[PDB]
Symmetry: C2
Subunit: 408 residues, 2 copies
């Protein structure tokens, strides 16, 4: 949720900023007045208690009187119930309000109008010499995934990684983790389980039943790496925090191919900053430079698009995608999303900024470095030859010096 | 299930072998006669069809006659139903019979009497200079797993791997995969999902709900690597097959420690052989030598125990455990199980041996190489110093040359 304080004229904050952000999200502007009207009620009860607190403690410092100090306690428990109700009803509207859309975000309702802002790399095309094959056919020819036997075993989109497929998957995971460890990141592998209560604050997911409470399978490392540091204080000397999240991922939405799948592995950049001095906006550039340097090391051409205000989800204040070149189909596909969600999750998760006045909260960002099966698919297409696939230079050490994967 | 043919005096096979194996499993010997009595019924119906087949086709080669060729079809569909019932009732008893216990297996009902057969390594002990800490306390001191934050997130026994904890986990996974790839193995990473129908032939597991049929989370790579090759023919030139299974594992049975946990990673040796020439018994030694060479490369002292006939599960014909030395508690704990299950799963999974007479079936074996979190725990205890933990020599390349993990 957003800071109630940014709706209060009282504290020297203009609620038009909220109204403008609603407009840019093509969402209710009327709700900003609804919330102001509710906040005011609630703060009156919040105060309408301390009226009967003082009048209660006023009687004290002395049945035309003894019956007066009776009702003033019946009051301060009756009115405390009203305060509870007000808080609750205020939660129901404020919950619905998206994060404040940064001004640099292109305003529009269709991702069709996503603003390309950067290009990189010399894109390969089908020549007369070699028709460029797609990832689906190159996985079959290389013999590095059993999607057929996978499908009988795990149901639809189910796949084994095999031989140099597993070595490659593992090569990319360790290349990514070392890549990021060199840039000040600490590895973190979360449990693939998470309690629904906790997921709430961070049903398009798998439910796992058995030991304890019903839990979800995680769609992204980003979800466990957000619950981590719940209810904690983080000291300014700790921030900024850089975690290289690693995990398997389970998506419900998706017998040939490993691009459009139910289970996959993923390195995530997850960063916490303090909420002042433009720190989170500086970290968003930092993480986006890291995503860039990495696809450049792999020598995969790409373009960076900024996401229209209309397409930002409720947590994101701003978002880029790195779309990389798939030469057989001459398309760019999404291999990175890079979000600054500022204090939106932090404030629900009571993740605070102080030593331990009025409450400050940390800023949190997330940026896929690589979804391995997707990155592989992109590697296959861009590195293919007449009779196999060359291995990118930087992955060659992690594959024991091998430079080539021949077709069966 | 076991080969019905080994219950038939008829084919030159002595059913006493079955009876003896039942004795060694301390299980029903009476059931071997029950099954013979059922098999005989079934084969009579199986034949009692071909009596009314020939008499039906006998009438043909000519209403004192035309009504005779009527009933002989009413028969051959009526008696075919009886054959179905016999087959089904025979399945219900034969299902309950364990695999034939190899003669080299120690006969006893208590694992207490497991026969140690081999020792290796110079075991470390608490000296006056250094009280040897346990894995639980060494994980806290090293700062390589958040079991506390894990527990709030994933419920009980839930843990993050962190910093050099993740690097180590990954070091062991890649050390194991290369270790095995050098010994003729092909990497395989299965889906962590598997359809209950399929699991049946390979409810102490997690159920996953969402897309498609209800599925289980796998307890071991061994389970998906068993369904793989279902209903297939394998050619003698293909066998023997060596797969290095890699996966996450989910066990229901288990906020400090990563040894006794719900989720963990595991390299498995899974091997298929032909069923003749003592091939599977030779492969069991091969896999057990591989498990040995690996804990020797890690320089972890261990002992090999042979499992008493009384403790073999229904698939295993024979089984060893490699128990490794945990010096703080001066105990050996199970880090490897090595099983030859011969044609027991193969025969349910219709995994055949021919080119493609009377049906031959492949032999299948499984042998944990490493459960990574457990192996780590064992590494921590055996490699500890006053102020940190040394990194095993062979894992040092995979950890970028680092030789030591200091306490926080």
């Amino acid at each position: 949720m957003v800071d109630i304080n940014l709706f209060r004229e009282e504290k020297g904050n203009n609620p038009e900023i909220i109204r403008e952000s609603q407009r840019r999200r093509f969402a209710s502007v009327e709700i900003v007045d609804e919330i102001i009207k509710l906040d005011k009620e609630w703060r009156q009860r919040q105060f309408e208690v301390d009226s009967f607190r003082k009048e209660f403690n006023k009687l004290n410092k002395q049945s035309e009187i003894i019956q007066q100090t009776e009702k003033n306690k019946q009051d301060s428990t009756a009115k405390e119930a009203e305060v509870r109700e007000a808080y609750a009803a205020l939660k129901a509207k404020l919950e619905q309000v998206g994060n404040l859309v940064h001004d640099s975000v292109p305003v529009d309702k269709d991702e069709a109008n996503n603003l390309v802002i950067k290009l990189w790399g010399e894109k390969r095309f089908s020549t007369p010499g070699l028709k460029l094959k797609n990832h689906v056919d190159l996985v079959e020819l290389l013999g590095i995934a059993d999607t057929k036997r996978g499908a009988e075993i795990a149901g639809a989109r189910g796949f084994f990684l095999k031989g140099d497929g597993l070595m490659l998957n593992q090569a990319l995971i360790n290349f990514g983790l070392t890549f990021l460890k060199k840039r000040g990141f600490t590895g973190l592998q979360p449990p693939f389980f998470m309690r629904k209560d906790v997921m709430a604050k961070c049903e398009e997911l798998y439910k796992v039943t058995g030991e304890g409470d019903d839990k979800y399978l995680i769609a992204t490392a980003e979800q466990p790496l957000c619950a981590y540091h719940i209810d904690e204080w983080i000291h300014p000397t700790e921030l900024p925090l850089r975690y290289a999240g690693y995990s398997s991922c389970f998506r419900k939405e998706a017998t040939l191919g490993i691009f459009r799948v139910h289970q996959f592995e993923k390195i995530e950049q997850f960063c916490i900053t303090g909420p002042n001095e433009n720190a989170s906006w500086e970290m968003l550039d930092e993480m986006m430079k890291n995503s860039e340097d990495f696809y450049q090391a792999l020598k995969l051409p790409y373009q960076i698009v900024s996401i229209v205000s209309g397409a930002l989800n409720d947590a994101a204040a701003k978002k880029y995608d790195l779309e990389a070149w798939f030469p057989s189909s001459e398309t760019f596909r999404e291999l990175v999303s890079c979000s600054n969600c500022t204090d939106y999750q932090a404030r629900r998760l009571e993740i605070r900024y102080g030593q331990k006045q009025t409450k400050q909260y940390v800023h949190m960002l997330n940026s896929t470095l690589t979804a391995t099966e997707r990155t592989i698919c992109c590697i296959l297409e861009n590195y293919q030859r007449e009779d196999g696939v060359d291995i990118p230079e930087v992955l060659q050490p992690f594959m024991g010096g091998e430079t080539f994967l021949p077709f069966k």
